[PDB]
Structure 1
């Protein structure tokens, strides 16, 4: 899991660095095993007519989390990206943890984090609603409205442009807080009925299908690797539909 030997880390936006370290710290002592991505993917680079895209992939699994994926990326010199999803094992009915950070020379442009529902009623489990409410409403000066496919995210979803360092740190700490809640709930979660497992499975499939509608990600991938490679990456590596 260690980020100390990452070639990208030293060159990424500081907020992305802190988030990557936080996520790695949350996962480090779990009962991890490797999760083999398609073609045993780790590092990948590509270029067509413009800038090069470089991606480093780390991916694990535990009994509660089917797939725990941390991706770090850079387009050319200046655009940095962090992607992370923890895909739950439907048996336990846990929500989906996700975060996405995009940064350029002007600073972080997008910071998104959520614990996303998998229940058919589109609500988080009661224990999560309670814990998340207790954190209080965070103040951020530059909130961004989610795109329509973003109906999958919970009412606790953050989507901002950080205005300053105070806000960058407040966002990172809130993701820490999400992870702490999530890891704890994973150990207390009652395993579920076959019908309930099916319900949660469908929520996760819908989440992936909706995430694949993000043309921001797709355009970045297509400009470095082309349409076919991007469709494979989005549907097989990033947001794989379990089935």
Structure 2
């Protein structure tokens, strides 16, 4: 749980709410710890500018090879929540991810998705059906995905929330995604070796494309340098499996 977090009480309220919702969804799963490189938990660094503070929590279950919740703060103003549930390819589940970035003046970016791992870039039929049933959410300020964002599903939300009502609507949609995802993980069956390979490739591709995110990289570089940032992005955030 998040009562021991040093960052949490200082983060944007939407970020606090979403972190609680994610922890609540994971709490009663068959969790084991997942050891990050160098058993990383808390880390802080500064070069010539602002300090970056990061808290990492990571778990695994039989269906999810790596469940990573990262909270971060740059200086006084910039707050970040990062979460990815990396599936075990044997079960063919999609990739849950979300990213929230907030400054003093409010949340600038809120993105969440259940991303495909199939070569045809479609979600499994059960997900399509369940997601369609939620209906189209209405948000006033949508943002267009960057070029490397071809990895995201047609259900991807990428917005700037315009008011508290939209903040709460976005959090609820993420809770709905997680409820669907946790349910489908109970009914998933181990796949064939050939299908497992296809899902593994989809996850590798997701990770390679997420590494092209310069907005993330530049934050890390300004606090820790180029070599540290490359190691962090490739080995901690978006590790390529074999």
Cα offsets for 1:29-61 (capped at 9, x unmatched)? 000000000000000000011000000000000
- Tell me, in whole angstroms, the C-alpha distance in 1 between the residues paired with 2:190 and 2:153: 22
1:101 is paired with a residue whose SS is: strand
- Tell me, in whole angstroms, the C-alpha distance in 1 between the residues paired with 2:68 and 2:129: 27
Displacement, 1:203?
A: 0.2
1:58 is paired with a residue whose SS is: strand
Give unpaired runs (5+ residues) of structure 2. Answer: none
Cα offsets for 1:161-186 (capped at 9, x unmatched)? 00000000000000000000000000
Pairing 1:1-243 to 2, within 5 Å after superposition: 2-243=1-242
- Tell me, in whole angstroms, the C-alpha distance in 1 between the residues paired with 2:227 and 2:210: 17
Cα offsets for 1:197-235 (capped at 9, x unmatched)? 000000000000000000000000000000000000000
Displacement, 1:148?
A: 0.4
Displacement, 1:141?
A: 0.3
Displacement, 1:96?
A: 0.2
The alignment covers a number of residue pairs equal to 242
- Tell me, in whole angstroms, the C-alpha distance in 1 between the residues paired with 2:135 and 2:224: 42
- Tell me, in whole angstroms, the C-alpha distance in 2 between the residues paired with 1:13 and 1:168: 11
Displacement, 1:71?
A: 0.1
1:137 is paired with a residue whose SS is: coil
Displacement, 1:190?
A: 1.7
2:191 is paired with a residue whose SS is: coil
Displacement, 1:63?
A: 0.1
Cα offsets for 1:8-38 (capped at 9, x unmatched)? 0000000000000000000000000000000
Displacement, 1:191?
A: 1.3
Displacement, 1:157?
A: 0.3
Displacement, 1:76?
A: 0.2
Q: Moved runs in structure 1, 4+ residues, more than 4 A?
A: none
TM-score using structure 2 length? 1.00
Cα offsets for 1:52-88 (capped at 9, x unmatched)? 0000000000000000000000000010000000000
1:191 is paired with a residue whose SS is: coil
2:21 is paired with a residue whose SS is: helix
